[PDB]
Design an enzyme around this catalytic site. Sequence first.
Site, short mmCIF file in Angstrom:
data_model
loop_
_atom_site.label_atom_id
_atom_site.label_comp_id
_atom_site.label_asym_id
_atom_site.label_seq_id
_atom_site.Cartn_x
_atom_site.Cartn_y
_atom_site.Cartn_z
N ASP A 52 -0.39 12.50 -5.18
CA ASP A 52 -0.65 11.64 -4.05
C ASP A 52 -1.99 10.93 -4.22
OD1 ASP A 52 -0.75 10.38 -1.73
OD2 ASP A 52 -1.21 12.12 -0.45
N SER A 99 -4.48 -7.33 -1.16
CA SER A 99 -3.47 -8.24 -1.70
C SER A 99 -3.77 -9.66 -1.26
CB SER A 99 -2.09 -7.76 -1.23
OG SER A 99 -1.05 -8.68 -1.55
#
Length: 330
Positions: free
Chosen positions: A35, A199
Amino acid sequence: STGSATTTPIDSLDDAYITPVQIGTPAQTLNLDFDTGSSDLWVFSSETTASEVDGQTIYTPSKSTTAKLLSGATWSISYGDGSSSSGDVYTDTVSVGGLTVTGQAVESAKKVSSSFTEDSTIDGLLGLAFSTLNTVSPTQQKTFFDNAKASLDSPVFTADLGYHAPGTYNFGFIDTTAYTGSITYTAVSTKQGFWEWTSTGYAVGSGTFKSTSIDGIADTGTTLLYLPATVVSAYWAQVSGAKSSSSVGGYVFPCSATLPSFTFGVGSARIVIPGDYIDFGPISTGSSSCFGGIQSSAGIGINIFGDVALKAAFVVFNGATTPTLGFASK
Ligand SMILES: CC(C)c1nc(CN(C)C(=O)N[C@H](C(=O)N[C@@H](Cc2ccccc2)C[C@H](O)[C@H](Cc2ccccc2)NC(=O)OCc2cncs2)C(C)C)cs1
Protein backbone atom coordinates in the site's frame (compact mmCIF):
# COMPACT_ATOMS: atom_id res chain seq x y z
CA SER A 1 20.65 -5.02 -4.19
CA THR A 2 17.28 -5.44 -5.87
CA GLY A 3 14.06 -7.37 -5.35
CA SER A 4 11.26 -8.45 -7.71
CA ALA A 5 7.93 -9.99 -6.64
CA THR A 6 4.75 -10.88 -8.47
CA THR A 7 1.53 -9.31 -7.22
CA THR A 8 -1.75 -11.14 -7.81
CA PRO A 9 -5.34 -9.86 -7.86
CA ILE A 10 -7.36 -11.28 -4.96
CA ASP A 11 -10.57 -11.69 -7.01
CA SER A 12 -12.02 -11.39 -10.49
CA LEU A 13 -12.55 -7.63 -10.17
CA ASP A 14 -8.97 -6.72 -9.24
CA ASP A 15 -10.28 -5.42 -5.87
CA ALA A 16 -6.75 -5.59 -4.42
CA TYR A 17 -3.41 -7.26 -5.08
CA ILE A 18 -1.43 -9.56 -2.79
CA THR A 19 2.30 -10.14 -2.78
CA PRO A 20 4.10 -12.91 -0.90
CA VAL A 21 6.41 -11.67 1.88
CA GLN A 22 8.85 -13.82 3.88
CA ILE A 23 8.97 -12.98 7.60
CA GLY A 24 11.19 -14.56 10.19
CA THR A 25 13.51 -17.54 10.46
CA PRO A 26 12.53 -20.10 9.19
CA ALA A 27 10.51 -18.02 6.79
CA GLN A 28 6.79 -17.54 7.34
CA THR A 29 5.22 -16.47 4.03
CA LEU A 30 2.27 -14.13 4.30
CA ASN A 31 0.39 -12.51 1.44
CA LEU A 32 0.41 -8.79 2.04
CA ASP A 33 -1.35 -5.88 0.37
CA PHE A 34 1.38 -3.45 -0.69
CA ASP A 35 0.00 0.00 0.00
CA THR A 36 1.69 3.20 -1.25
CA GLY A 37 -1.05 5.08 0.72
CA SER A 38 0.00 4.00 4.23
CA SER A 39 3.19 3.30 6.15
CA ASP A 40 2.61 0.38 8.55
CA LEU A 41 3.69 -3.21 7.90
CA TRP A 42 1.16 -5.13 9.96
CA VAL A 43 0.13 -8.77 9.94
CA PHE A 44 -2.42 -11.18 11.21
CA SER A 45 -0.61 -13.06 13.97
CA SER A 46 -0.77 -15.58 16.76
CA GLU A 47 -1.73 -12.60 18.94
CA THR A 48 -4.81 -11.67 16.90
CA THR A 49 -8.11 -12.11 18.79
CA ALA A 50 -9.24 -15.54 17.65
CA SER A 51 -12.74 -14.48 16.66
CA GLU A 52 -11.24 -11.89 14.32
CA VAL A 53 -9.26 -14.40 12.27
CA ASP A 54 -11.09 -16.21 9.47
CA GLY A 55 -8.81 -18.01 7.04
CA GLN A 56 -5.80 -15.69 7.01
CA THR A 57 -2.28 -16.97 7.36
CA ILE A 58 -0.73 -15.76 10.62
CA TYR A 59 2.69 -14.72 11.73
CA THR A 60 3.86 -16.50 14.90
CA PRO A 61 6.82 -14.58 16.34
CA SER A 62 7.58 -17.31 18.88
CA LYS A 63 8.44 -19.66 15.98
CA SER A 64 10.97 -17.19 14.55
CA THR A 65 14.51 -17.37 15.86
CA THR A 66 15.19 -13.80 14.60
CA ALA A 67 12.03 -12.20 16.07
CA LYS A 68 12.56 -9.74 18.95
CA LEU A 69 9.82 -7.91 20.83
CA LEU A 70 10.17 -4.16 20.30
CA SER A 71 9.61 -3.49 23.97
CA GLY A 72 6.85 -1.06 24.84
CA ALA A 73 5.96 -0.28 21.23
CA THR A 74 2.32 -0.27 20.13
CA TRP A 75 0.52 0.72 16.97
CA SER A 76 -2.98 1.71 15.95
CA ILE A 77 -4.26 2.69 12.52
CA SER A 78 -7.54 3.90 11.12
CA TYR A 79 -8.10 3.89 7.37
CA GLY A 80 -10.15 6.05 5.02
CA ASP A 81 -12.90 3.38 4.70
CA GLY A 82 -13.34 3.26 8.49
CA SER A 83 -11.43 0.00 8.92
CA SER A 84 -8.74 -0.32 11.59
CA SER A 85 -6.21 -2.54 13.33
CA SER A 86 -3.86 -2.31 16.31
CA GLY A 87 -1.34 -4.29 18.29
CA ASP A 88 2.26 -4.64 19.42
CA VAL A 89 5.54 -4.82 17.52
CA TYR A 90 8.39 -7.22 16.78
CA THR A 91 11.51 -6.68 14.74
CA ASP A 92 12.33 -9.49 12.37
CA THR A 93 13.89 -10.36 9.02
CA VAL A 94 11.59 -9.49 6.08
CA SER A 95 12.25 -10.43 2.45
CA VAL A 96 10.36 -9.39 -0.66
CA GLY A 97 11.28 -10.96 -3.99
CA GLY A 98 14.82 -11.77 -2.84
CA LEU A 99 15.48 -8.39 -1.15
CA THR A 100 16.09 -8.76 2.61
CA VAL A 101 15.73 -6.21 5.42
CA THR A 102 16.97 -7.20 8.86
CA GLY A 103 15.44 -5.45 11.88
CA GLN A 104 12.18 -4.55 10.11
CA ALA A 105 9.31 -3.51 12.38
CA VAL A 106 6.56 -6.13 11.97
CA GLU A 107 3.38 -4.85 13.57
CA SER A 108 1.51 -7.80 15.05
CA ALA A 109 -2.29 -7.30 15.18
CA LYS A 110 -4.08 -7.98 18.41
CA LYS A 111 -7.29 -6.50 16.95
CA VAL A 112 -8.57 -6.05 13.40
CA SER A 113 -11.88 -4.61 12.23
CA SER A 114 -14.54 -6.62 10.43
CA SER A 115 -13.51 -5.75 6.90
CA PHE A 116 -10.07 -7.32 7.49
CA THR A 117 -11.53 -10.41 9.15
CA GLU A 118 -13.94 -10.90 6.27
CA ASP A 119 -11.19 -10.93 3.69
CA SER A 120 -9.41 -14.24 4.02
CA THR A 121 -7.00 -13.46 1.17
CA ILE A 122 -5.19 -10.51 2.76
CA ASP A 123 -2.82 -11.49 5.57
CA GLY A 124 -1.79 -7.89 6.31
CA LEU A 125 -0.45 -4.66 4.83
CA LEU A 126 3.00 -3.57 3.73
CA GLY A 127 3.07 0.24 3.72
CA LEU A 128 5.05 2.11 1.11
CA ALA A 129 4.11 5.73 1.83
CA PHE A 130 6.57 7.93 3.76
CA SER A 131 7.71 6.75 7.18
CA THR A 132 6.41 9.99 8.74
CA LEU A 133 2.95 8.36 8.61
CA ASN A 134 3.96 5.22 10.53
CA THR A 135 1.84 4.81 13.63
CA VAL A 136 4.23 2.99 16.01
CA SER A 137 4.54 4.69 19.39
CA PRO A 138 6.54 5.87 21.18
CA THR A 139 9.31 5.28 18.59
CA GLN A 140 8.10 5.65 15.01
CA GLN A 141 9.35 2.97 12.63
CA LYS A 142 10.56 2.91 9.07
CA THR A 143 8.84 1.26 6.15
CA PHE A 144 10.36 -1.72 4.35
CA PHE A 145 11.39 0.56 1.45
CA ASP A 146 13.01 3.21 3.72
CA ASN A 147 14.96 0.47 5.49
CA ALA A 148 16.07 -1.10 2.21
CA LYS A 149 16.74 2.12 0.28
CA ALA A 150 20.39 2.72 1.04
CA SER A 151 21.22 -0.89 -0.02
CA LEU A 152 19.29 -0.74 -3.29
CA ASP A 153 21.05 -0.23 -6.61
CA SER A 154 18.74 2.81 -7.13
CA PRO A 155 16.46 4.32 -4.44
CA VAL A 156 13.25 3.39 -6.27
CA PHE A 157 10.44 0.90 -6.44
CA THR A 158 7.95 0.34 -9.26
CA ALA A 159 4.35 -0.81 -9.41
CA ASP A 160 3.13 -2.63 -12.52
CA LEU A 161 -0.35 -3.82 -11.69
CA GLY A 162 -2.19 -6.12 -14.07
CA TYR A 163 -5.69 -5.93 -15.46
CA HIS A 164 -7.33 -9.28 -14.66
CA ALA A 165 -3.79 -10.61 -14.36
CA PRO A 166 -0.74 -10.64 -12.10
CA GLY A 167 1.74 -7.82 -12.11
CA THR A 168 5.03 -6.91 -10.51
CA TYR A 169 6.60 -4.90 -7.71
CA ASN A 170 10.31 -4.20 -8.31
CA PHE A 171 12.71 -2.68 -5.80
CA GLY A 172 15.98 -0.95 -6.73
CA PHE A 173 15.72 -0.96 -10.52
CA ILE A 174 13.58 0.15 -13.46
CA ASP A 175 12.71 -2.67 -15.87
CA THR A 176 12.93 -0.89 -19.23
CA THR A 177 11.16 -3.87 -20.90
CA ALA A 178 8.01 -3.39 -18.82
CA TYR A 179 6.69 -0.20 -20.47
CA THR A 180 6.37 1.48 -23.87
CA GLY A 181 7.60 4.91 -24.78
CA SER A 182 9.23 7.03 -22.09
CA ILE A 183 8.63 7.61 -18.40
CA THR A 184 7.26 11.04 -17.53
CA TYR A 185 8.29 12.19 -14.03
CA THR A 186 6.27 14.65 -11.97
CA ALA A 187 6.85 16.42 -8.68
CA VAL A 188 5.75 14.98 -5.34
CA SER A 189 4.80 16.72 -2.13
CA THR A 190 5.66 14.70 0.95
CA LYS A 191 4.14 17.22 3.38
CA GLN A 192 1.20 14.92 4.18
CA GLY A 193 3.31 11.72 4.07
CA PHE A 194 1.88 10.46 0.77
CA TRP A 195 3.03 10.14 -2.82
CA GLU A 196 1.07 13.31 -3.53
CA TRP A 197 1.27 14.78 -7.05
CA THR A 198 -0.70 16.96 -9.48
CA SER A 199 -2.27 15.62 -12.63
CA THR A 200 -2.48 18.09 -15.49
CA GLY A 201 -6.00 17.27 -16.63
CA TYR A 202 -8.37 14.65 -18.07
CA ALA A 203 -10.38 13.51 -21.01
CA VAL A 204 -13.47 11.34 -21.28
CA GLY A 205 -13.48 8.86 -24.14
CA SER A 206 -12.53 10.51 -27.41
CA GLY A 207 -13.41 13.95 -26.04
CA THR A 208 -11.12 16.90 -25.78
CA PHE A 209 -8.55 17.09 -23.04
CA LYS A 210 -9.34 19.51 -20.24
CA SER A 211 -6.28 21.16 -18.79
CA THR A 212 -6.81 21.48 -15.05
CA SER A 213 -4.63 20.71 -12.01
CA ILE A 214 -5.84 17.75 -9.94
CA ASP A 215 -3.86 17.05 -6.76
CA GLY A 216 -4.05 13.50 -5.47
CA ILE A 217 -2.20 10.50 -4.09
CA ALA A 218 -0.79 7.49 -5.94
CA ASP A 219 -2.39 4.76 -3.80
CA THR A 220 -2.03 1.03 -4.54
CA GLY A 221 -4.10 0.18 -1.44
CA THR A 222 -7.33 1.68 -2.84
CA THR A 223 -9.23 -0.02 -5.61
CA LEU A 224 -10.94 2.87 -7.39
CA LEU A 225 -10.17 6.27 -8.88
CA TYR A 226 -11.62 9.03 -6.61
CA LEU A 227 -11.73 12.49 -8.24
CA PRO A 228 -13.56 15.81 -7.82
CA ALA A 229 -17.31 15.63 -8.34
CA THR A 230 -17.10 17.85 -11.46
CA VAL A 231 -14.72 15.38 -13.20
CA VAL A 232 -16.70 12.36 -12.14
CA SER A 233 -20.00 13.83 -13.34
CA ALA A 234 -18.45 14.65 -16.73
CA TYR A 235 -17.34 10.98 -17.04
CA TRP A 236 -20.64 9.33 -16.11
CA ALA A 237 -22.72 11.78 -18.18
CA GLN A 238 -21.30 9.91 -21.20
CA VAL A 239 -22.84 6.61 -20.08
CA SER A 240 -26.58 6.20 -20.81
CA GLY A 241 -28.47 5.50 -17.63
CA ALA A 242 -25.63 6.12 -15.21
CA LYS A 243 -26.47 7.88 -12.00
CA SER A 244 -25.23 8.55 -8.50
CA SER A 245 -27.13 6.33 -6.09
CA SER A 246 -27.19 7.52 -2.46
CA SER A 247 -28.40 4.11 -1.47
CA VAL A 248 -25.48 2.18 -3.02
CA GLY A 249 -22.91 4.83 -2.22
CA GLY A 250 -21.83 6.18 -5.58
CA TYR A 251 -22.20 6.01 -9.32
CA VAL A 252 -23.84 2.95 -10.84
CA PHE A 253 -24.53 2.21 -14.48
CA PRO A 254 -26.47 -0.34 -16.51
CA CYS A 255 -24.54 -3.58 -16.82
CA SER A 256 -25.50 -3.50 -20.53
CA ALA A 257 -23.34 -0.42 -21.12
CA THR A 258 -20.00 -0.20 -22.89
CA LEU A 259 -17.91 2.29 -20.92
CA PRO A 260 -15.74 5.06 -22.38
CA SER A 261 -12.06 5.34 -21.54
CA PHE A 262 -10.74 7.96 -19.11
CA THR A 263 -7.45 9.80 -19.75
CA PHE A 264 -5.42 11.55 -17.09
CA GLY A 265 -2.46 13.87 -17.64
CA VAL A 266 1.04 13.49 -16.30
CA GLY A 267 2.88 16.62 -17.35
CA SER A 268 2.41 16.77 -21.15
CA ALA A 269 1.94 12.97 -21.30
CA ARG A 270 -1.31 11.07 -21.09
CA ILE A 271 -2.34 7.77 -19.47
CA VAL A 272 -5.41 6.08 -20.92
CA ILE A 273 -7.59 3.92 -18.66
CA PRO A 274 -9.65 1.65 -20.94
CA GLY A 275 -13.42 1.60 -20.33
CA ASP A 276 -13.37 -2.03 -19.25
CA TYR A 277 -11.11 -1.15 -16.30
CA ILE A 278 -13.92 1.04 -14.91
CA ASP A 279 -16.49 -1.78 -14.63
CA PHE A 280 -16.73 -3.24 -11.12
CA GLY A 281 -19.65 -5.53 -11.80
CA PRO A 282 -23.09 -5.96 -10.33
CA ILE A 283 -23.82 -4.07 -7.12
CA SER A 284 -25.26 -7.29 -5.73
CA THR A 285 -25.19 -10.76 -7.16
CA GLY A 286 -27.39 -10.96 -10.25
CA SER A 287 -28.22 -7.25 -10.38
CA SER A 288 -28.31 -5.43 -13.67
CA SER A 289 -26.90 -2.28 -11.99
CA CYS A 290 -23.11 -2.23 -12.04
CA PHE A 291 -20.69 -0.31 -9.78
CA GLY A 292 -18.51 2.35 -11.33
CA GLY A 293 -14.76 2.46 -10.96
CA ILE A 294 -14.50 6.27 -11.02
CA GLN A 295 -16.16 7.84 -7.97
CA SER A 296 -16.28 11.20 -6.25
CA SER A 297 -13.66 12.04 -3.67
CA ALA A 298 -15.94 14.62 -2.06
CA GLY A 299 -15.90 14.03 1.64
CA ILE A 300 -12.75 11.91 1.58
CA GLY A 301 -10.76 15.13 1.62
CA ILE A 302 -8.20 13.95 -0.91
CA ASN A 303 -8.27 12.70 -4.48
CA ILE A 304 -7.00 9.13 -4.86
CA PHE A 305 -5.31 7.62 -7.90
CA GLY A 306 -6.07 4.03 -6.87
CA ASP A 307 -5.61 0.78 -8.72
CA VAL A 308 -8.02 1.63 -11.55
CA ALA A 309 -5.66 4.41 -12.58
CA LEU A 310 -2.32 2.90 -11.61
CA LYS A 311 -2.89 -0.40 -13.39
CA ALA A 312 -3.08 1.48 -16.69
CA ALA A 313 0.55 2.56 -16.20
CA PHE A 314 4.03 1.50 -15.22
CA VAL A 315 4.60 3.64 -12.10
CA VAL A 316 7.94 4.63 -10.64
CA PHE A 317 8.08 5.66 -6.97
CA ASN A 318 11.39 7.54 -6.87
CA GLY A 319 12.69 7.81 -3.32
CA ALA A 320 15.70 9.99 -4.19
CA THR A 321 16.58 12.89 -1.93
CA THR A 322 13.78 14.85 -3.63
CA PRO A 323 11.16 12.18 -4.34
CA THR A 324 9.25 12.14 -7.64
CA LEU A 325 6.71 9.90 -9.39
CA GLY A 326 7.02 8.52 -12.93
CA PHE A 327 4.35 7.23 -15.24
CA ALA A 328 4.70 5.31 -18.51
CA SER A 329 2.17 3.62 -20.75
CA LYS A 330 2.52 -0.14 -21.15
C1 LIG B 1 -13.27 -7.05 -1.98
C2 LIG B 1 -12.73 -6.42 -0.71
C3 LIG B 1 -11.83 -7.37 0.09
C4 LIG B 1 -12.03 -5.11 -0.99
N1 LIG B 1 -12.55 -3.94 -1.16
C5 LIG B 1 -11.59 -2.97 -1.37
C6 LIG B 1 -11.95 -1.53 -1.56
N2 LIG B 1 -11.74 -0.72 -0.36
C7 LIG B 1 -12.45 -1.10 0.85
C8 LIG B 1 -10.95 0.43 -0.48
O1 LIG B 1 -10.45 0.79 -1.54
N3 LIG B 1 -10.87 1.20 0.66
C9 LIG B 1 -10.09 2.46 0.59
C10 LIG B 1 -9.25 2.49 1.89
O2 LIG B 1 -9.65 2.89 2.97
N4 LIG B 1 -7.99 1.96 1.73
C11 LIG B 1 -7.11 1.91 2.90
C12 LIG B 1 -7.31 0.63 3.75
C13 LIG B 1 -7.32 -0.70 3.02
C14 LIG B 1 -6.17 -1.50 3.03
C15 LIG B 1 -6.14 -2.75 2.40
C16 LIG B 1 -7.27 -3.20 1.75
C17 LIG B 1 -8.44 -2.42 1.71
C18 LIG B 1 -8.44 -1.18 2.35
C19 LIG B 1 -5.67 2.05 2.36
C20 LIG B 1 -5.43 3.34 1.56
O3 LIG B 1 -4.09 3.39 1.07
C21 LIG B 1 -5.76 4.63 2.34
C22 LIG B 1 -5.77 5.88 1.41
C23 LIG B 1 -6.24 7.14 2.11
C24 LIG B 1 -5.33 8.07 2.62
C25 LIG B 1 -5.79 9.22 3.29
C26 LIG B 1 -7.16 9.45 3.42
C27 LIG B 1 -8.08 8.52 2.91
C28 LIG B 1 -7.63 7.36 2.25
N5 LIG B 1 -4.76 4.83 3.44
C29 LIG B 1 -5.23 5.25 4.66
O4 LIG B 1 -6.38 5.33 5.05
O5 LIG B 1 -4.18 5.60 5.44
C30 LIG B 1 -4.60 6.41 6.57
C31 LIG B 1 -3.55 6.53 7.60
C32 LIG B 1 -3.71 6.64 8.98
N6 LIG B 1 -2.53 6.74 9.71
C33 LIG B 1 -1.48 6.71 8.91
S1 LIG B 1 -1.89 6.55 7.25
C34 LIG B 1 -11.01 3.71 0.61
C35 LIG B 1 -10.16 4.98 0.55
C36 LIG B 1 -11.95 3.65 -0.62
C37 LIG B 1 -10.30 -3.45 -1.41
S2 LIG B 1 -10.32 -5.14 -1.14
